[PDB]
Write a protein that binds this ligand. Sequence first.
Ligand SMILES: *[C@@H]1O[C@H](CO)[C@@H](O[C@@H]2O[C@H](CO)[C@@H](O)[C@H](O)[C@H]2NC(C)=O)[C@H](O)[C@H]1NC(C)=O
Ligand SMILES: *[C@@H]1O[C@H](CO)[C@@H](O[C@@H]2O[C@H](CO)[C@@H](O)[C@H](O)[C@H]2NC(C)=O)[C@H](O)[C@H]1NC(C)=O
Ligand SMILES: C[C@H](NC[C@H](O)CP(=O)(O)Cc1ccccc1)c1ccc(Cl)c(Cl)c1
Ligand SMILES: C[C@H](NC[C@H](O)CP(=O)(O)Cc1ccccc1)c1ccc(Cl)c(Cl)c1
Ligand SMILES: *[C@@H]1O[C@H](CO)[C@@H](O)[C@H](O)[C@H]1NC(C)=O
Ligand SMILES: *[C@@H]1O[C@H](CO)[C@@H](O)[C@H](O)[C@H]1NC(C)=O
Ligand SMILES: [Mg+2]
Ligand SMILES: [Mg+2]
Lengths: 663, 664
Amino acid sequence: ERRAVYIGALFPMSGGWPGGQACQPAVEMALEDVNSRRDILPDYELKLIHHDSKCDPGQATKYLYELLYNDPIKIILMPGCSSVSTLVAEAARMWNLIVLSYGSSSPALSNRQRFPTFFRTHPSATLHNPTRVKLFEKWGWKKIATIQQTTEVFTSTLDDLEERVKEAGIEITFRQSFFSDPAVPVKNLKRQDARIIVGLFYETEARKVFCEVYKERLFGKKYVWFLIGWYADNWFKIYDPSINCTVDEMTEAVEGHITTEIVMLNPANTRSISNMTSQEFVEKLTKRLKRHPEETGGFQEAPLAYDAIWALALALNKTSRLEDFNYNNQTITDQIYRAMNSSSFEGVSGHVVFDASGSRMAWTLIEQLQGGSYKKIGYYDSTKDDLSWSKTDKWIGGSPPADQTLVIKTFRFLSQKLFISVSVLSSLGIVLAVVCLSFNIYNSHVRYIQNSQPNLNNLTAVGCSLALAAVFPLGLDGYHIGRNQFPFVCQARLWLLGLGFSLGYGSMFTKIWWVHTVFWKLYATVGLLVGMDVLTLAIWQIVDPLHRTIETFAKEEPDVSILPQLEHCSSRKMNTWLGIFYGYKGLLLLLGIFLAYETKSNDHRAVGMAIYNVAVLCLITAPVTMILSSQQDAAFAFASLAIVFSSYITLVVLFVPKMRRLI
Amino acid sequence: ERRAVYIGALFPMSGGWPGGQACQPAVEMALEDVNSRRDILPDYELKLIHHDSKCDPGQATKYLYELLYNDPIKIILMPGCSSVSTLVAEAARMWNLIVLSYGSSSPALSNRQRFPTFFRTHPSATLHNPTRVKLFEKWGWKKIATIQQTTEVFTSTLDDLEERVKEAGIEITFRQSFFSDPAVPVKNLKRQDARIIVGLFYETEARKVFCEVYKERLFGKKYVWFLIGWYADNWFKIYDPSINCTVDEMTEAVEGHITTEIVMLNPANTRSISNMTSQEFVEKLTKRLKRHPEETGGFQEAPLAYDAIWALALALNKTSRLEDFNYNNQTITDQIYRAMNSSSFEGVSGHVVFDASGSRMAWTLIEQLQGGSYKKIGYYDSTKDDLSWSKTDKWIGGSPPADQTLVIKTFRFLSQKLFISVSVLSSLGIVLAVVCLSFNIYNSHVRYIQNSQPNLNNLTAVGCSLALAAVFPLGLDGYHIGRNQFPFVCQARLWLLGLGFSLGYGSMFTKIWWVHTVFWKLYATVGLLVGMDVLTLAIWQIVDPLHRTIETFAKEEPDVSILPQLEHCSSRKMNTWLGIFYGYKGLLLLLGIFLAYETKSVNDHRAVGMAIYNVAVLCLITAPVTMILSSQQDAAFAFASLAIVFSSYITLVVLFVPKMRRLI
Ligand SMILES: *[C@@H]1O[C@H](CO)[C@@H](O[C@@H]2O[C@H](CO)[C@@H](O)[C@H](O)[C@H]2NC(C)=O)[C@H](O)[C@H]1NC(C)=O
Ligand SMILES: *[C@@H]1O[C@H](CO)[C@@H](O[C@@H]2O[C@H](CO)[C@@H](O)[C@H](O)[C@H]2NC(C)=O)[C@H](O)[C@H]1NC(C)=O
Ligand SMILES: C[C@H](NC[C@H](O)CP(=O)(O)Cc1ccccc1)c1ccc(Cl)c(Cl)c1
Ligand SMILES: C[C@H](NC[C@H](O)CP(=O)(O)Cc1ccccc1)c1ccc(Cl)c(Cl)c1
Ligand SMILES: *[C@@H]1O[C@H](CO)[C@@H](O)[C@H](O)[C@H]1NC(C)=O
Ligand SMILES: *[C@@H]1O[C@H](CO)[C@@H](O)[C@H](O)[C@H]1NC(C)=O
Ligand SMILES: [Mg+2]
Ligand SMILES: [Mg+2]
């Protein structure tokens, strides 16, 4: 005779998860297969005492104590629902019992302080998370947003996920759990601009949140969505009275969302401990269901029950000492615990290895929605990092997005059609100045050319030419210069402007000063002006010299955000030096024009109109430029136009008539 | 004899909430007081069968069934913790038992589908939320924030709070879930700008999150913090290993945080069903505790046990039929249920009424931290809406902040000192023009003044005067005008400028053409210019007239957020018409200066020519400037006004000063 052995079991034949329909037949098949074998428990015989629980802890504790405070005496319990398993595991160390939940996937059952006798063949839900991070590091996403329904599972899953992301060079950006309304969740996902979402919720919360993401147009090539694989295929094509949207409005919202689930069946065909395979066990089972698989609940979680009872039989074989087990002996349970901890074998679900938490690790699966059809992608094992991709992820732009918009620092440059025009004009001006200088030099014998002070009109021409040349450097801002030779340009601007204007006005101003005092000493002042200019410029460049500075405008650009930067070479006390120099030159302009109005009565009376014109131009242009600093292509426009027009006018005024009369 | 009646109970003497230490003595006192009375249950006698539970659902179901599958037969259960109460209350309909919890504050127990036999003398935690809304609506806060520890309570409290805020003219603006360490919670409260926070967490979580709110400088006059008042007084002055901060860095971070907590004791002195009061019941109890109250556990939740057993005895007196109670009869339990829901009486804890969810309502007492001291504030009742202020809320800014930063619309105006100086200058210019006109009119016979066309110099002066007048409308942007007269100004600007510049430059240019003929025919062109100007201006005002347009710049200048506005008036095609007009007038300027350069040899000719050249260069360098500086006041107007005034001054002096200097 065989010493009978009993095991309590609680099978949910109804409720949120009806997984007893397909997991009672599996347990019975496994009992038959383990008792037919005469090498496992030949001295004993396993027997089952089933009770319904409805995945309800009220129906559950009643039957638990009906099967606990009654004979026969049990050696183990098998609760499937997370709630019943949680209650049973917590309230078993008080009876010295082992609990072997074949269908509970609550991370809270991985704790050994409350659940010191708990083992399960059903992987936890945290086991999606080793995958997600090992799916972010691939695509390198460090900024993440998470949303979670309020359930007894998803509350711990994101905790595990944060703990696992911290140690993965990744961080979270947004998280908000909705009890019943996901709208403000999506509203903040749109406000915070989270392009990567991790959606933990059941089918109904899904159909309720996707009819909100569509309403918020928060999908497409700039948004990714992770979910769970448990949702039945073709779940968005189902009535959703609370979802005001429609099939066509959702199928586009859930287009290309990733889905990490677990695999509860060895895709291999290699035999197992029971000399059976998956394709064979599925048939042997479906031959025992009064209903069909699609109508039989818990059909994907039957192999877990099979493997659980098989692991029980094994870990009970090593022990082999059981007919004398009472609810007060904390030693038989410890023997069975050390036998179950060391439980390694290949069952229908795969290789079962119970971690220290009691749970078992398994192979994660990954899918992606590709036109109303789920398309497997890859597998991942949190044990050996063995990631088996399949190159089937069809994104929108051939590659996946990233955390956030990239702020590219763009530089603003002149139109580059204005620069060419101003430069052509300045070159023509230099040509004209040289032509006039030559016509004057060659005119060293004529009277009108002899009377007109030529040694000062030549200086006027030289200064006008220098100023004209100052045009090209005024536009070099990166399109044609580098950060190394850039101070060269920012210094050439200053020196050319300074010296050119100094001479161009000193000649024509000493001429009027002489005309005044007189109605070869002119060279004295004609040189003293340039000397004061050189001295003040050197003092400026010694005290506060020019150096490159980048000015950043308001960041915006119509998936990158281009923040514009202007390359302005400016000193620290710049404005002060500019104001000082402009004030000195303005005093000088005003004195020159006053002396011109006073001394109106050779070739010195015409220079007065030129003086006044240059004066008004510079006076109206300097402050303009000082104000238009924040604008390129306009400040330079006025500066270059003022320079070139002053030059053209001065030259054609006080050099042209000479030839017009001498020609 | 008396037919004994038994009561199963589960008292937590250890765990997160050790509330059996002070609730077993209270139970026993209640049983003594309810059996010493011969007018409640004279045929019966209540007896207790207790078991410790440690607020542990493992140590709890063991004893539950040691007292369920054993004799004697129990008629009711009394669990204290919320885990234990959630475990029992769902495993009682299976035995047809009544569950009467004196210490469970979980909203999940206000459900009749899982817990149809459950009553509790301990109010739920949702009972804080009717207060909070009745404390937001007052201070007008439609945008709030939340964070929640991970517990079996706070998860449902914010659910109730959303359900109750939606239906009260309120809307949430943030939420999160501090599980292990609050770091992103506060960071997003700073980023999302949550100035109103509702933090539900246990003391450990508090001391852990406040050493982060400080580190983030997320407190002050612009932030308000709501909490629960269950934390013991002077709880921030305690060691905090993970909280690198200290009392000095926390006492300032928890300054002025509201702590709405329930009141478990009648502050009144009125007697109760037991002919006892609060100041007396507390003494009688403390005379039964081997430890000190502050050191004893569950000392504030004993009155609830007393009231619970009294309610049980009352609702069991009406029923009076109990010595034959089996676990399979679903009728005695229904009698006791209809007797318990109809239970109203004044006990130590107050008025003991049981809502449809089994729970009871009560009085929430508000508190606020004022210098390391909790300062009571008005109570509240979710039923009567009765709020009883004490007027002790000491805010920082003499008043409480609001949800966000009020965005004000700012109208930028001219310096208003520039305007005065420039107006003075334009007025002096008009005075000068009038003086010169009067002189030119008086000396109309002298050849020195008979040569210069006076019928045209008068027009030049009239135009200069009009242009000078155009300076005043150019600075009226609201500081001196309203939205009604503002188009009048945006029309006067146009007409004065146009007509004055016409009568000036057209007149001088026709005079130049006339003197060119040498190298009433002039009146013809001097009038045709102004006529074409009037025609084109009327076309513009009839097709695309000027209307006030506002320019909005980026918000800046920092709790008021200043939204800057620019009072402009430019038509839709304003740029097009302006460019057309400026191009035409520039062509005319160039033609005039060319005719002058050609007529430089052929009275008042060179003066007119120099004036033409100056006015031309000034207008040419000034118009596009003012067109680019549209987005800048005090600069565009500055250039425009200085140009107009200098053009007027010069065009007047150049050709009227020599006249008088020679005629003197
Ligand atoms: C497991 O099943 C396989 C196939 O059903 C068994 O392999 C057969 O064993 C029989 C012995 O009765 C042989 O006659 C056949 O030739 C085998 N077929 C093949 C394809 O190998 C195997 O023996 C079973 N394992 C056991 C019983 O331990
Ligand atoms: C309730 O208690 C009060 C006082 O605690 C009782 O009133 C006293 O009654 C006694 C009778 O034993 C008198 O001697 C005292 O003079 C009363 N004192 C006061 C202040 O009234 C009252 O009788 C009690 N009610 C009951 C027992 O029903
Ligand atoms: C893989 C997992 N197996 C079943 C859990 O193990 C039962 P649970 O109690 O842990 C969570 C639970 C789930 C549904 C309804 C109530 C509860 C699972 C999860 C969701 C679904 Cl839809 C399916 Cl088909 C399968
Ligand atoms: C008013 C309430 N009285 C006790 C609850 O009624 C027991 P609970 O189980 O419902 C929640 C619970 C509380 C603490 C530790 C574990 C659990 C209460 C709430 C918070 C605190 Cl910190 C305290 Cl001291 C007291
Ligand atoms: C059962 O235990 C026996 C030892 O008595 C053994 O040798 C056999 O391999 C066991 N069956 C297994 C491990 O499947
Ligand atoms: C009290 O309970 C009874 C049923 O026993 C029910 O009819 C009644 O509505 C309840 N009272 C309230 C206020 O819900
Ligand atoms: Mg799937
Ligand atoms: Mg308090």
